Design an enzyme around this catalytic site. Structure first.
Site, PDB file in Angstrom:
ATOM      1  N   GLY A  60       0.812  -1.199   0.000  1.00  0.00           N
ATOM      2  CA  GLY A  60       0.000   0.000   0.000  1.00  0.00           C
ATOM      3  C   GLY A  60       0.855   1.263   0.000  1.00  0.00           C
ATOM      4  N   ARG A 128       5.891   1.422 -13.431  1.00  0.00           N
ATOM      5  CA  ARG A 128       5.318   2.206 -12.330  1.00  0.00           C
ATOM      6  C   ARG A 128       4.389   3.303 -12.845  1.00  0.00           C
ATOM      7  NH1 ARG A 128       7.394   0.635  -7.515  1.00  0.00           N
ATOM      8  NH2 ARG A 128       6.608   2.539  -6.512  1.00  0.00           N
ATOM      9  N   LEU A 189       9.614 -10.250  -7.450  1.00  0.00           N
ATOM     10  CA  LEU A 189       8.989 -11.533  -7.154  1.00  0.00           C
ATOM     11  C   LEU A 189       7.751 -11.725  -8.004  1.00  0.00           C
ATOM     12  CD1 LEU A 189       9.180 -11.318  -3.224  1.00  0.00           C
ATOM     13  CD2 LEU A 189      10.565 -12.824  -4.682  1.00  0.00           C
ATOM     14  N   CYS A 255      14.003 -17.192   8.997  1.00  0.00           N
ATOM     15  CA  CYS A 255      13.051 -16.084   9.077  1.00  0.00           C
ATOM     16  C   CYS A 255      12.972 -15.483  10.467  1.00  0.00           C
ATOM     17  CB  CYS A 255      11.656 -16.556   8.668  1.00  0.00           C
ATOM     18  SG  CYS A 255      11.571 -17.072   6.940  1.00  0.00           S
ATOM     19  N   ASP A 271       6.036  -9.378   5.579  1.00  0.00           N
ATOM     20  CA  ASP A 271       5.235  -8.578   4.626  1.00  0.00           C
ATOM     21  C   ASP A 271       4.985  -9.354   3.290  1.00  0.00           C
ATOM     22  OD1 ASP A 271       4.390  -6.157   2.997  1.00  0.00           O
ATOM     23  OD2 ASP A 271       6.585  -6.136   2.616  1.00  0.00           O
TER      24      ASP A 271
HETATM   25  C1  LIG Z   1       4.858  -2.726  -1.752  1.00  0.00           C
HETATM   26  S1  LIG Z   1       5.653  -1.106  -1.715  1.00  0.00           S
HETATM   27  C2  LIG Z   1       4.760  -0.218  -0.396  1.00  0.00           C
HETATM   28  C3  LIG Z   1       5.288   1.207  -0.172  1.00  0.00           C
HETATM   29  C4  LIG Z   1       5.138   2.167  -1.365  1.00  0.00           C
HETATM   30  N1  LIG Z   1       3.829   2.035  -1.992  1.00  0.00           N
HETATM   31  C5  LIG Z   1       6.245   2.003  -2.398  1.00  0.00           C
HETATM   32  O1  LIG Z   1       6.008   1.649  -3.576  1.00  0.00           O
HETATM   33  O2  LIG Z   1       7.411   2.229  -2.051  1.00  0.00           O
HETATM   34  C6  LIG Z   1       7.249  -1.492  -0.943  1.00  0.00           C
HETATM   35  C7  LIG Z   1       8.310  -1.927  -1.975  1.00  0.00           C
HETATM   36  O3  LIG Z   1       7.993  -3.203  -2.544  1.00  0.00           O
HETATM   37  C8  LIG Z   1       8.320  -3.176  -3.917  1.00  0.00           C
HETATM   38  N2  LIG Z   1       7.618  -4.199  -4.725  1.00  0.00           N
HETATM   39  C9  LIG Z   1       6.372  -4.123  -5.289  1.00  0.00           C
HETATM   40  N3  LIG Z   1       6.127  -5.279  -5.960  1.00  0.00           N
HETATM   41  C10 LIG Z   1       7.217  -6.086  -5.834  1.00  0.00           C
HETATM   42  C11 LIG Z   1       7.538  -7.349  -6.314  1.00  0.00           C
HETATM   43  N4  LIG Z   1       6.697  -8.042  -7.080  1.00  0.00           N
HETATM   44  N5  LIG Z   1       8.757  -7.902  -5.981  1.00  0.00           N
HETATM   45  C12 LIG Z   1       9.665  -7.220  -5.208  1.00  0.00           C
HETATM   46  N6  LIG Z   1       9.346  -5.966  -4.740  1.00  0.00           N
HETATM   47  C13 LIG Z   1       8.149  -5.412  -5.053  1.00  0.00           C
HETATM   48  C14 LIG Z   1       7.916  -1.768  -4.343  1.00  0.00           C
HETATM   49  O4  LIG Z   1       8.439  -1.340  -5.591  1.00  0.00           O
HETATM   50  C15 LIG Z   1       8.430  -0.967  -3.154  1.00  0.00           C
HETATM   51  O5  LIG Z   1       9.793  -0.656  -3.377  1.00  0.00           O
HETATM   52  S1  SF4 Z   2      11.976 -11.474   4.391  1.00  0.00           S
HETATM   53 FE1  SF4 Z   2      10.282 -12.789   5.207  1.00  0.00          FE
HETATM   54  S2  SF4 Z   2      10.472 -14.690   3.975  1.00  0.00           S
HETATM   55 FE2  SF4 Z   2      12.456 -13.593   3.715  1.00  0.00          FE
HETATM   56  S3  SF4 Z   2      13.781 -14.428   5.346  1.00  0.00           S
HETATM   57 FE3  SF4 Z   2      12.799 -12.570   6.208  1.00  0.00          FE
HETATM   58  S4  SF4 Z   2      10.948 -13.351   7.307  1.00  0.00           S
HETATM   59 FE4  SF4 Z   2      11.643 -15.005   5.908  1.00  0.00          FE
HETATM   60  S1  SF4 Z   3       4.781  -0.784  -5.545  1.00  0.00           S
HETATM   61 FE1  SF4 Z   3       3.399   0.581  -6.748  1.00  0.00          FE
HETATM   62  S2  SF4 Z   3       1.329  -0.397  -6.704  1.00  0.00           S
HETATM   63 FE2  SF4 Z   3       2.619  -1.433  -5.129  1.00  0.00          FE
HETATM   64  S3  SF4 Z   3       2.098  -0.391  -3.187  1.00  0.00           S
HETATM   65 FE3  SF4 Z   3       3.978   0.736  -3.970  1.00  0.00          FE
HETATM   66  S4  SF4 Z   3       3.179   2.359  -5.357  1.00  0.00           S
HETATM   67 FE4  SF4 Z   3       1.425   0.959  -4.902  1.00  0.00          FE
END
Ligand SMILES: C[S@@+](CC[C@H](N)C(=O)[O-])C[C@H]1O[C@@H](n2cnc3c(N)ncnc32)[C@H](O)[C@@H]1O
Ligand code: SF4
Ligand code: SF4
Ligand code: SF4
Ligand SMILES: [Cl-]
Ligand SMILES: [Cl-]
Length: 364
Positions: A60, A128, A189, A255, A271
Site C-alpha cells: 500500500g 510504475r 517476485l 526467518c 510482509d
Molecule cells: C509494496 S511497496 C509499499 C510502499 C510504497 N507504496 C512504495 O512503492 O514504495 C514497498 C516496496 O515493494 C516493492 N515491490 C512491489 N512489488 C514487488 C515485487 N513483485 N517484488 C519485489 N518488490 C516489489 C515496491 O516497488 C516498493 O519498493
Molecule cells: S523477508 Fe520474510 S520470507 Fe524472507 S527471510 Fe525474512 S521473514 Fe523469511
Molecule cells: S509498488 Fe506501486 S502499486 Fe505497489 S504499493 Fe507501492 S506504489 Fe502501490
C-alpha cells in the site's frame, strides 16, 4: 526491543505498478487505520518494549493515510512513551504525493524514508504507472528533490525486473548522476505460488545473474576510484563475511517475525505473507509476546530452518545461507525448495568473491 511494520492505508494505493502484488486494486484492503487501532498499537508497543522500538510505515501507499494521521502518531508516541525509549520511525513511499508539508514533517520528526525509484524515466515508467495509466517518474523525482531540500534522510528502493537486467548501465549511471548513494535493489517476485517466470517483467535466474555481475562491476570500479556507494545486498554479504551475521532479514538463512500490522490491527510474521493462513492475531487483543508465541508464528519461523541438501554441500553456504525463504516457497503447504536464485548466487560468487574480499579487507 520491538519492531513493527504497519500498513496505515492497508493495501490501498494510488498507483498500479505492473509487478506489484501488494496493492488492493485487483488483495484485501481494510481501509485507513482508525485512531483507536493506532493508539492501541502505540500504547502497547511502548508499554511492552525494552531498550528501544521501531515503527515502519508501508503498504500500500502509506501517505494515503494523510499527514494528520502521522501527526497523530507522533502525539501518541509522546503520550505513551513513559519509559523514554528511543523510537525509530520510517516510511516507504512511492513519493507521488509528497509535497513540502510532508517533507518538513519527515525531516522534523527524523523519519528514515525509502523512496521507490526503478531507474531513469523510461525504465521507471515501464512498470510504475498510476491507477489511471499515467507516468509517475517526474513526481518521484519531485519527491527526491523535496527530500534534498528539507534534509530528509532517504534511500532508494529499486525493483529488479528483466528490463533492469538489460540496462544496468543506465540504472547505475542515473542514480550516480542524482548522487543517490544509498541503494536497495529488490529482486522482482512473481506472485506467491504462481508458476515462476511467466510475466514480461519476471526476473529469471539468468537475468538476475546478469544483473548482479554487471552491478558489481560498476560498484567495484567506483570503490577503486574512491566513490563509496552503499548497496544493501553487497553490504549484507560484507556483514556476513566480517561478522558472520547480517542485519538484513533474508540473508541469515532463517526467518524472523516482523510484526506486520494491517489497518484493522491484524498481525502477520512477514510482509510477503499477509495472508489468512499466517494471521497471528490482533494487536488490540494480544501482547507482542503472545503474538510471537502463537503456533502460527512458531510454524512460520520453524519451516525456514530446513536446509536444502544442495546447500549442505555448497562452498558458498556460509555466505549465502540458502537465501530468503520467500524465494524457496514454491507451492502452498509444501516443504521449501532450493532457492529460485541459487544458480545466480553461485555464478555471481564465482565472479565477485575475491573482489568482495578485497573490499571486506579495506573496510577492516
Ligand atoms: C509494496 S511497496 C509499499 C510502499 C510504497 N507504496 C512504495 O512503492 O514504495 C514497498 C516496496 O515493494 C516493492 N515491490 C512491489 N512489488 C514487488 C515485487 N513483485 N517484488 C519485489 N518488490 C516489489 C515496491 O516497488 C516498493 O519498493
Ligand atoms: S523477508 Fe520474510 S520470507 Fe524472507 S527471510 Fe525474512 S521473514 Fe523469511
Ligand atoms: S509498488 Fe506501486 S502499486 Fe505497489 S504499493 Fe507501492 S506504489 Fe502501490
Ligand atoms: S548458492 Fe545455492 S546451494 Fe549454495 S547456499 Fe546458496 S542456495 Fe544453497
Ligand atoms: Cl514522467
Ligand atoms: Cl541491494
Amino acid at each position: 526491543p520491538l519492531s513493527l511494520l504497519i500498513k496505515p492505508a492497508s493495501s490501498g494505493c494510488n498507483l498500479k505498478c505492473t509487478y506489484c502484488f501488494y496493492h488492493s486494486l485487483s488483495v484485501k484492503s481494510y481501509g485507513i487505520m482508525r485512531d483507536e487501532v493506532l493508539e492501541s498499537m502505540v500504547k502497547r508497543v511502548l508499554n511492552e518494549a525494552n531498550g528501544h522500538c521501531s515503527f515502519a510505515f508501508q503498504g500500500g501507499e502509506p501517505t494515503l493515510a494523510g499527514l494528520e494521521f502521522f501527526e497523530k502518531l507522533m502525539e501518541l508516541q509522546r503520550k505513551h512513551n513513559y519509559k523514554n525509549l528511543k523510537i525509530y520511525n520510517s516510511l516507504q513511499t512511492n513519493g507521488t504525493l509528497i509535497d513540502e508539508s510532508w517533507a518538513k514533517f519527515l525531516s522534523e520528526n527524523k523519519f528514515l524514508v525509502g523512496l521507490s525509484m526503478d531507474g531513469p524515466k523510461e525504465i521507471h515508467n515501464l512498470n510504475r504507472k498510476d491507477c489511471c495509466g499515467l507516468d509517475t517518474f517526474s513526481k518521484v523525482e519531485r519527491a527526491a528533490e523535496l527530500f534534498k531540500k528539507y534534509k530528509v534522510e532517504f534511500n532508494i528502493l529499486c525493483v529488479v525486473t528483466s528490463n533492469t537486467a538489460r540496462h544496468v548501465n543506465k540504472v547505475y549511471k542515473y542514480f550516480k548522476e542524482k548522487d543517490f548513494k544509498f541503494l536497495q535493489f529488490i529482486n522482482c517476485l512473481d506472485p506467491l505460488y504462481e508458476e515462476k517466470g511467466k510475466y514480461n517483467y519476471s526476473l529469471k535466474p539468468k537475468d538476475y545473474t546478469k544483473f548482479l555481475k554487471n552491478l558489481f562491476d560498476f560498484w567495484y570500479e567506483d570503490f577503486l576510484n574512491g566513490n563509496r556507494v552503499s548497496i544493501r545486498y553487497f553490504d549484507g554479504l560484507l556483514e556476513t563475511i566480517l561478522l558472520g551475521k547480517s542485519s538484513s532479514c533474508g540473508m541469515n538463512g532463517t526467518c524472523t517475525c516482523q510484526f506486520v500490522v494491517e489497518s484493522d490491527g491484524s498481525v502477520y510474521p512477514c510482509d510477503f505473507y499477509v495472508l489468512d493462513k499466517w494471521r497471528l492475531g490482533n494487536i488490540q487483543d494480544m501482547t507482542m509476546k503472545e503474538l510471537f508465541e502463537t503456533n502460527k508464528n512458531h510454524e512460520f519461523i520453524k519451516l525456514s530452518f530446513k536446509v536444502h541438501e544442495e546447500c549442505k554441500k555448497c562452498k558458498w553456504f556460509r555466505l549465502c545461507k540458502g537465501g530468503c525463504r520467500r524465494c524457496r516457497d514454491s507451492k502452498e503447504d509444501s516443504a521449501l525448495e532450493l532457492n529460485y536464485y541459487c544458480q545466480s548466487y553461485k555464478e555471481f560468487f564465482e565472479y565477485a568473491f575475491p573482489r568482495l574480499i578485497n573490499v571486506a579487507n579495506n573496510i577492516k
